[PDB]
């Protein structure tokens, strides 16, 4: 059965650093024939369906890894996200949380 899993549920990141948010999926059940789509969606306070600040690192997809990279994390990146992977009609998702640390 197609499932998504999150190796880590909470990521703690210093303001200004990078983070690679990971969700793993059963690549054996996907085909670039039927298509794969991955999406990191911010749960609260975002007018876009998918996070505009993250980029999927596509080279990991053949390993069943959806890695969503934010190169310079900002305070407003904090909060819960859903990582969604779709392979054809199959899909699953998990939640992860980004906690942003700042020192003033
Ligand atoms: Na937040």
From Swiss-Prot:
Impact reported for residue 14 to S: No effect on PDCD1 binding
Cell compartments where the protein resides: Cell membrane
Effect of residue 46 to S: No effect on PDCD1 binding
Effect listed in the UniProt record for changing residue 39 to Y: No effect on PDCD1 binding
Glycosylation site residues: 45
Stated consequence of mutating residue 94 to S: Abolishes the binding to PDCD1. Costimulates proliferation and IFNG production of T-cells
Residues covered by the Ig-like V-type domain: 2-99
Tree of life domain: Eukaryota
Effect of residue 20 to Y: No effect on PDCD1 binding
Tissue specificity remark: Expressed in immature and mature bone marrow-derived dendritic cells and splenic dendritic cells. Highly expressed in placenta, liver and weakly expressed in heart, spleen, lymph nodes and thymus. Also expressed in some tumor cell lines of lymphoid origin.
Disulfide feature: 23-83
Function: Involved in the costimulatory signal essential for T-cell proliferation and IFNG production in a PDCD1-independent manner. Interaction with PDCD1 inhibits T-cell proliferation by blocking cell cycle progression and cytokine production.
Entry similarity comment: Belongs to the immunoglobulin superfamily. BTN/MOG family.
Subunit structure: Interacts with PDCD1.
The protein, known as: Programmed cell death 1 ligand 2
Organism of origin: Mus musculus
Gene, per the UniProt record: Pdcd1lg2
Portion held of the full protein: 20 to 123 of 247
